[model samples]
Target chain A: RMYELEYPSPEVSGQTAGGPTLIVALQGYADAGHAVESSSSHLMDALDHRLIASFNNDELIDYRSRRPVVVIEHNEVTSMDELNLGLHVVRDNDNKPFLMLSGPEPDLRWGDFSNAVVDLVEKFGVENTICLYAAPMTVPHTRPTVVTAHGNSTDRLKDQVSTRMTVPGSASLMLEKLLKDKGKNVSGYTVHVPHYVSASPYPAATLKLLQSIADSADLNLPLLALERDAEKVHRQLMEQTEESSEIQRVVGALEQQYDSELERYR
Target chain B: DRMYELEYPSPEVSGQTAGGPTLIVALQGYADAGHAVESSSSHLMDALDHRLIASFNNDELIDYRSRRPVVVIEHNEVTSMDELNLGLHVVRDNDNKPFLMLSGPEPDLRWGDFSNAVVDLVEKFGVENTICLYAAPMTVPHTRPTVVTAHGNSTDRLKDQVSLDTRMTVPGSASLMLEKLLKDKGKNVSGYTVHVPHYVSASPYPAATLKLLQSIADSADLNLPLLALERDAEKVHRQLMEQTEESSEIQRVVGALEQQYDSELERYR
Candidate 1:
């Protein structure tokens, strides 16, 4: 009902890792600074991976409410963004294995999708899970990216904000909560990006998120190239700030707020 | 089915801010008494700088059998199926203030889930106020000005808002369900339904559409025009008056209805 396994059904091929982790990064929810987008591509490109499961789009997508795109040119339909939501088996730099669930967030049946992820987790002997996100914030880009950790999981990563509030929920959070409910070690990280730069890929936060995930999960992630790119972005950002007096002033104000909060807390 | 096909909001829409835009919801249903949502939704799309952002999977939501797709057929060969679309579009007003509009056929299946998915958009886009419009046949005559019925806690908040306190159960709709769902979520939401002349409800009653658009403009604090729809209303009225003049029997009924309508107005105000 959820998805049938593609090539390398490690369940049938062979039990490689007894407790591989499942990392979730969806397109539609919680991608604040394009952090998930960066991290997802990073994991896919750097690791040895294969298509593990192709999710049934028909069961999940409500095409009527959100019709798929069709490119028409010269009075004829040309193409469409054949939307894909899938799961992959990705290995780390050290050949340690994990599962990655990435795609457009399913518009319908969060519970069903959650269940499918859970069933796959159980079937593949996935004893742990991780969710990735990018959170846009009013904080300054001049400062180091702040990574917030939360979820009902075993590893000790404290949440940045505490609240008894009801906001919108996401498929990523749904799966995290569901897996946690089933007694799986579940963790989630959302790196905060400067609100102004949230539209594009903020590699600083993306790298920070990867560092945090690697640190917590004990994976040897390839980060030298990512770190270099982050530095370049930082250099370009500084140059941009130099050109605009108003931007510098805004950054100055943000710096005051950032340091002042630290001053008070200490 | 997948939730969204793409993300195409203008670069300015950074979902990080706490500010929520006004979301106009016009999910099609049998309750569209005067093609009000259709006419007004198209107006907003045409008159504003609009772009597609939220596209959902229609495979599960639409019952193709109920509302068949428009197929271009020539010489016994099918060329293309004009697929029906329901999507959330980001529309910038004349003042450059942007809002969102969700339009098209209401989901034939899983309305609760659709409401939940739309709520996800409200969260993603930071939608503060949700507005919807519909029109219904009333005993009021086409000769008189159209009356509007507004539902929501923001009656006093909306400018030029009106309501009828009559208690009658109409058929339940997705928008009604959405109104309740949003209310439960502690969100600001409302709907405006105009009263159309009973006899003219079967056709595109641009007058009633104009009333609904005007009410929506007031409620959402957006700059919308009744220019095209207003012109159509006058033309239709001209034809209607000529038709009435040709039939004394039809004139008698309209006269009686106008008299009754005026009496009610006199008694109230």
Candidate 2:
């Protein structure tokens, strides 16, 4: 009811690797380590893309509560920030086409926005819908980002999901639920970001999230750029921990717990 | 930030209306010294007839960590969620004349884009003048009459409002950005800010709200009613006086402030 079709749907036909996939990675909703933001932006930046649809702002956005920004240069207003809740058709590193619904999540009209995305799902004949995100985990940043699959999922990259709990709401969650309810293949891949690195960008988590997507969706997504960024951040963290005795002790014990967990499962 | 038009019944489409009414920006966040912006905005909407006009998206603007959405949990079950809202409302004053008001918390992000979005809406609705309202805490006595300070790059608009000789650099807000941008475009814009007592700045003081409303009425030429706020202001004033009589410390503090205030006024001559 809210989304507007910006460009005609790109032709989707039966092909190898299980046909077309829709990657849902939104910002501003528990976007720990900025994994979601980085992955989404990378897809749009590193690949060939086109805007497929846009969500309605007035119906979905509450201005006073959320507040839009205006830029002023001396007396002139140079720019005004606009919402970027859009669906884009992106070509992966292999030149394989996929749909990415990225940007800040809608603040209102969850039901309508979900229904509209569902409509686009049917129209585009998207076969596999993979949601990418990152959550704050007690685990250390020293460890690799762990991708946990959820919501009627078929698999996980780390410890298997054998439990359940109620959590906060995000548009990606509702979209995944609706798609699964409709007998569609949908799975959310949440990378476990270190609690300490939750608020800031962790390029390692972004790299891991993309890696999970590349493997799950069978698409050749770019990762070298993120890897380089991750390596740079890793060196800086090592240098910091080397100087602070308290931090070194904290990370030292955290590494022990991580190593033991992997060893104890046997 | 989000930018879109609200669905108002029989609204004036850009082509249908040749001109739009004055736009009052009452974004409550920075410098709401006595909750003046909040009170004035609430009073305007409560006392007048208004409809949806336009709104900005909060998802991209608000930092949820600072202000969490309330979830009502009753009897071990989640019940309701109080959603936040900010919008442009088309209000009809006492004379049934229309003006647009953007009332909400000041946005946390993207001051540039947000300001432009406002200008966009202003242009679309043909708003020739944009007026901002708020209350700022100042070293003044609450016993004295509330003074509404007028400012903007628009000289003609301020010619009719209060004047100040002092010039000092201040931090920016979304509405302040709008005032500058609007003036830069050769449009009329002014801020009617009431200087409330800094000692009681944390709480709501209707006296400041009353003065702001009066200023808006005079400058915007709107037939806004003042009786209800007049009563509220008087009630709050009497209660404040009663409380001050019990506290000699507050009385002495106010006395010092009044002395300083009168001295500054005398220097103006």
Candidate 3:
């Protein structure tokens, strides 16, 4: 079944907006070995706010917890069946509420991830939308981590730090259909995780995603304080010798294809 | 579900002109059938030596064996249960050659209809589509025919040099659906529309079809037998043109509102 959810808050007596700022965090395509048994190490700690933990079967083990956290934060959690449809709501220290959406990594069905994001966008107005996502790309762990960003409408952005933009195809595909049928404004950003240890959890990717989100939303995240530990982790991997020269050759070839493919569009 | 064959050989692509005369026929919101029939008759009458062939509503038979030759036109044959009173019309030429396929008389102002089944049958018989024209009255002016802009996603001949007026939107049903289907199977699709005077939509408007036929011919690369249809269509157009006076009054109010919209748009530019 398709994953769908509507938040339980602001009371049934009235339905309106100006609810709260919602941040949607998503983990994109991950290889099987990198799939996890717990949300214990997920990016919930980066932001000051953390809620319940929720995950799905593809990444779910026999004894995993069913709590929905680091996703959506709301004032209420009504009685709903456990489809593992993660709907976690919480509040920041200042009493302003926040929302986050996360679950086990999706396998063959990628549309399930996009649709879940769309449903959340519809329920909460675009004004409240903030999305966080991480994906693997070929890069050396030895260099400075760079987080790239894109949005549906750049004019709505405070500072349009221009980046090479593609159609934002998957997210914007659904957005365009909805807008043509029933108008709405939606936007997102995808971060490039350094490829070296991407075959593993590489928590630094999640840490950088939060740093960019903090900059975009103008909320300060403690990513700078946590940067030292992330660097140490990368430094140890670089000390190894006898790296496969063939693997280095393939990475060089792939990086060239990626750059030229985007240059054709411009 | 009524389908007919054009039975015509392919037109020479190289021989096709850069552009040709067009006729736009809109099958949008029809206020009344009498107005539609009356206005259509006027437009068709303007044509020189206009001939009527019965193939669209072919289920209804005619007794051609009689000396004078009898012709019957059936309009109420297809019943639509949808909120919009949508119907399909197929026009045939003098030799029973199919000229155009149309869909509509949609009852509601907000909704749209596209005749997919009709387009499929028409193409299956290898009809090289020229121009597709539809008319719908929008919140637009009528002092002159509203320039309903054209947007071609696939055809190079239909590409635009001028900035597109994208305030107008076409529904994603029949035409879009069929266009994509045809593209997947490799076929040509061209769509044209006339912005009908929104104020006068309650009455008949011949000017809309006048523009439609012109665009249709141009898009299809066919020389419009414009004068012939014009003469036949005059009587019907004459009556509809009379109603345009009151519509002109409403036009003034809409035009005033247009300035504020135009200014706001200009500021962004």
Candidate 4:
């Protein structure tokens, strides 16, 4: 048996109704300000979800490159902080079923991982697949966060933007490409967080992502809880900007550049 | 389509040969110390007449950050580039006996699949046995003979040597995994890892390569030509002896390790 994945419950495979959408968020490679973590955590907390599947970190992860944490008490190992790759079955507020896949990206066997996800897509009768990530960019915290979608031209979200890109491939992107080849509808969204404030959790970026998902996918996802946290962060950011004239100048210049870009788009 | 592609360079009729040749694999990674495997593989190739029998797409096996391939662009025109690949070579020794060797970087992904591919090749060629060679640094002294050890299902066939049998877990390498996988399939498989003194690990220690080739010969009964490697070993030995004589501290350490090694040898006798 391949040590790649295991299902503790067989019920995960026997679903016969509700072809759900799968939201994939694998940590690493351009995740800035923990945007995926905050948004996915909020969604999972707001819904009744259970672990449906797990990928073995031992076989998938390169521990020599990314070491695991071992906690020792007295003389013996007390616990280990094992890396996780899991699938959770969840539902939106309208009782629409969806799947949430969140985990650290596999360190090796990307081809195998892509195939495994494709297998899940077929087994779960998934209707569509989407991936979420955040990248730090020159945008400022003062302006509303912008997200760009990439996928089949016809299925792209509204108000989509594009750039001539030649970047390295990530496992999530590889999975997306595979899904498209298999004749499955797939899309991805990258939230642009401010480079200056990207080192810490950006609740505002998470709020933008949640709102975008609701608008694009037409799901009644809960927003008030995250919105309240986002407002607090906004106020905190304002206070931080007010203390330093140099930061104030940077934000002003960024706002000017951002407005001009918006003008060109309009 | 899969990311990796395997090519066969030999004629199809070669598979019908009656006697099977032994396979020697030396993949670059954790097992390489003082370039022992590299030197040993090159020596084997030079000593015998060989031809490439198989190759794997390097793009699938090598990770760019670990060892990046260089691309040379001249005046906006593609000039030259380095292409890395894993290959299997078939060689005829002095006695006209055939043997197989698989060498290259260990695949960074799909290890299980790659190992299965190797086993398939073994079955196709009707290989009699498989051996893997490696070198690792140890605290032993260079003045003493290099300690060689064996592991896997073919361990019983290996002659009595300094065997350090203990239970400990280290990071897994693809070669070691291949041995285990082949052994589970009930195939004759063994691996030899030579212990190079940690102090001389930074230099090209040819003695380790010589010992490894000798071990492979003893285990597989192949009369490998190793005179060139012997000369290299002797030259390196003389250089090391001169360096030690120039430093009393190093000389003292060598003498102490020699005493320890001699006492252990006495116990074994």
The better candidate by TM-score, 2 or 4, is 2
Q: Per-chain TM-score of chain B, candidate 4?
A: 0.89
lDDT of 1 by residue, B136-161 (tens): 88887779998886666555545664
| Global fold similarity of model 4 (TM-score) | 0.57
Best of the candidates, TM-score: 2
Off by over 4 Å in 4: A1-9, A12-104, A108-266, B1-18, B69-81, B267-269
In candidate 4 the C-alpha lDDT for residue A258 amounts to 93
**lDDT minimum window of 10 residues, candidate 4 chain A:** A70-79
Per-candidate iRMS values, in order, are 17.7, 7.6, 21.8, 9.7
Where model 3 places Cα greater than 4 Å from the true spot, the runs are A1-19, A28-43, A46-83, A93-95, A105-128, A153-183, A241-266, B1-269
Question: Which lDDT tens digits does candidate 3 get at residues A1-266?
Answer: 44423433332111233554445543333321131211213434533344333434322211112122211012111122222435455433333445566544333244554565556656654354555445466655544444444444334444222344454344334433554345444445445556556666554655565555455544444455456656766665544422657655655675675566546745
lDDT (10s digit) by residue, model 4, range A1-266: 21334446534332345577788888776678789877778888898777778786645765435434433233222334445678778777766667888878777778988888889889888877888889898988888888888876325456455567897789899999999998888888888999987889988778777776776666779989777877888899999999999999999999999999989988
Question: After aligning candidate 1 to the native by TM-score, how far in Å is the CA of A158 from where it should be?
Answer: 10
Tens-digit lDDT track for model 2 on A79-129? 456657898888876677888998778777889989998888888878788
Score residue A31 of candidate 4 by CA lDDT: 73
Q: RMSD in angstroms, all models? A: 21.8, 9.0, 24.0, 10.6
Model 4 per-residue lDDT at B140: 82
Per residue, candidate 3 scores C-alpha lDDT tens digits across B92-121 of: 333333344444332111111123444555
- Tens-digit lDDT string for candidate 1 (A120-161): 888878767878888788888888787766776535443243
**Candidates by lDDT, descending order:** 2, 4, 1, 3
lDDT, residue A202, candidate 3: 58
